[PDB]
Amino acid sequence: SGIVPTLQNIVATVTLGCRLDLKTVALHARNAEYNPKRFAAVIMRIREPKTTALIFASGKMVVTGAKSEDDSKLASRKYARIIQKIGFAAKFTDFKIQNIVGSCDVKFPIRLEGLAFSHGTFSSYEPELFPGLIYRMVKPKIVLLIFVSGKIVLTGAKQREEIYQAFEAIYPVLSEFRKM
DNA sequence: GCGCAGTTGTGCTATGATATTTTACAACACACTATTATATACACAGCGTGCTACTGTT
Secondary structure, X not given: OOOOOEEEEEEEEEEOOOOOOHHHHHHHOXXXXXXXXXXXXXXXXXXXXXXXXXXXOOOEEEEXXXXXXXXXXXXXXXXXXXXHHHOOOOOOEEEEEEEEEEEEEOOOOEOHHHHHHHOOOOEEOOOOOOOOEEEEOOOOOOEEEEOOOOEEEEEEEOOHHHHHHHHHHHHHHHHHOEOO
8 A cells, every 4th residue: 555545625615694795796806706697606716725715695605626624724714804805794604624525546457347246235337427436435434436547536525534544445445356 | 548569679599529829277386406626537529730632823
C-alpha cells in the first residue's frame, strides 16, 4: 500500500440568518452571476481560496470547490463578509460540511466484472452505461467509483476519516482483482 | 269471454372402439428535481486545420 487518498472537493452549507435581495447582491459583488430564469441563486466566486458559492434569498448559502476543510470554512467566512459589506445583517452561522470527495491511484488494472460478481450486493456495473463500477460500502457508508485503470473515486463522506477508512477497506479487494 | 287457428318454441336425433393436435375536463395539491463542485472515463459530435486537387492566369 502506501497510498492515501487526495481530497478533491468539499461542499458546505452556511446560514446567513437574514433575507437577501439577490439583484442587489449580484450587482454589488465583484464576481457574481444571477439569471433568475435559469437558477434561483446568485453564483458568487472568490479567488482565494478558489471556490464558488450559491447564495439564496432565504439567506442560506452553499459553498463548493474547496480542496480542504480549512479552505471551506475560510472561503465561507469570506463570502459572509462580502454579504455584510454589501449591507445586510448577515451572520456566519451553522457552518457544516455535507460532502467530501477523494481520489487515488492503486497503480494496477482491475477486473471489474470479477469484482462485481464477487461483491454483487454492494456493486453495480453496467460498462455500456458508465465505465466504472459503483461500490456502495456499508461501514463506513461511502460510495466508490472503481475504474479498470486503477483510478478510484470515494464520495458521500461527512468526515475525512471516512474517505481514509473506505480506501483501507477496499484496497485488499482491489488487490484480489488485479490484472498485473 | 271463450274457442279455435294460426304462430312460435322445444326436446331429441345407433352401439362400442381407437389413433393425434394445443364520463370527461379542470383545478388543486403534493412530490420531485434544476444548479454548483470533484475526481473518474468512455463516446459522440462538431470545429478547425492541413493537404490535395483543380482552375485560372501569366
